[PDB]
Design a protein around this ligand. Structure first.
Ligand SMILES: [Hg+2]
Ligand SMILES: [Hg+2]
Ligand SMILES: [Hg+2]
Ligand SMILES: [Mg+2]
Length: 198
């Protein structure tokens, strides 16, 4: 999807200033003056980075982050604050913080953090799509096929698999053919990689 920077900050100058900065850099931008309007619109499939104010009406920045943690939305966060004297908590850092930046911010520092965040989002999403794709491929196998797969990745020959399970060799052959097609692999090497991957 399009790289989108979500900007959450109650202050108009921040929202407009960042919209302009981020557009002038090739990012789509979405802004919210509240945490809950963000959460209401948030789709965890949207590729992006969150730039987040500490203090806003309603939920604070940390409180929004707690919601995102709770629902396993792993979007990366660049925290911004006008009160640099108040440190981030250890928990706020661990829950996906890219960086903690002051307002007013160095434009380039902010841009570098967002670039860092987009790459971490791209990576995270790829590892999500892969796991998702592999659960659907593996879930599409029958119990019988599962039994054959388990022995196959143990290096057994069809003859030995047949004897172990009490089925005909042709039955094993056919199960093996169907496993390859279901899991979309053309070699025993790639079959074993896939099972280990998942
Ligand atoms: Hg709002
Ligand atoms: Hg809305
Ligand atoms: Hg981003
Ligand atoms: Mg604020």
């Amino acid at each position: 999807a399009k790289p989108t920077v979500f900007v959450v900050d109650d202050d108009m100058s921040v929202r407009e200033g960042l919209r302009n900065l981020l557009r002038s850099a090739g990012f789509e931008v979405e802004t919210f003056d509240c945490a809950s309007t963000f959460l209401e619109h948030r789709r965890p499939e949207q590729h992006g980075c969150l730039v987040l104010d500490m203090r806003m009406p309603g939920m604070s920045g940390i409180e929004l982050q707690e919601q995102l943690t709770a629902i396993s939305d792993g979007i990366p966060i660049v925290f911004i604050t006008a009160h640099g004297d108040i440190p981030m908590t250890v928990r706020a850092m661990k829950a996906g913080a890219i960086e903690f930046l002051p307002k007013p911010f160095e434009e380039q520092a902010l841009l570098d953090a967002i670039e860092q965040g987009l790459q971490l989002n791209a990576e995270r999403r790829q590892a999500r799509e892969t796991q998702d794709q592999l659960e659907q491929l593996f879930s599409s196998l029958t119990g019988r096929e599962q039994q054959v797969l388990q022995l196959t990745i143990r290096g057994l020959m069809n003859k030995q698999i047949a004897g172990e399970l009490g089925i005909a060799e042709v039955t094993v052959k056919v199960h093996r053919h169907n496993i390859m097609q279901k899991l979309n692999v053309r070699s025993l090497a790639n079959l074993v990689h896939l099972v280990e991957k998942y």
